[PDB]
Amino acid sequence: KNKSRVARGWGRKCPLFG
């Protein structure tokens, strides 16, 4: 599974995945 790899959804400015 993707714990942080899913961050691709947005960028970094978002806290969700930093």
mmCIF file of C-alpha atoms in Angstrom:
data_model
loop_
_atom_site.group_PDB
_atom_site.id
_atom_site.type_symbol
_atom_site.label_atom_id
_atom_site.label_comp_id
_atom_site.label_asym_id
_atom_site.label_seq_id
_atom_site.Cartn_x
_atom_site.Cartn_y
_atom_site.Cartn_z
ATOM 1 C CA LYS A 1 0.000 0.000 0.000
ATOM 2 C CA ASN A 2 0.952 3.673 -0.285
ATOM 3 C CA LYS A 3 1.263 5.491 3.042
ATOM 4 C CA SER A 4 2.908 8.654 1.715
ATOM 5 C CA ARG A 5 3.415 7.765 -1.947
ATOM 6 C CA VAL A 6 -0.220 8.787 -2.412
ATOM 7 C CA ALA A 7 0.989 12.349 -1.861
ATOM 8 C CA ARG A 8 1.148 12.484 -5.658
ATOM 9 C CA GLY A 9 -2.482 13.554 -5.402
ATOM 10 C CA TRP A 10 -1.411 17.128 -4.699
ATOM 11 C CA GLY A 11 1.882 18.714 -3.696
ATOM 12 C CA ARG A 12 3.570 19.556 -0.402
ATOM 13 C CA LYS A 13 1.854 22.756 0.736
ATOM 14 C CA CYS A 14 -0.900 20.418 1.926
ATOM 15 C CA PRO A 15 -0.511 18.921 5.427
ATOM 16 C CA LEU A 16 -2.397 15.757 4.475
ATOM 17 C CA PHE A 17 0.836 14.337 3.059
ATOM 18 C CA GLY A 18 3.092 17.348 3.526
#
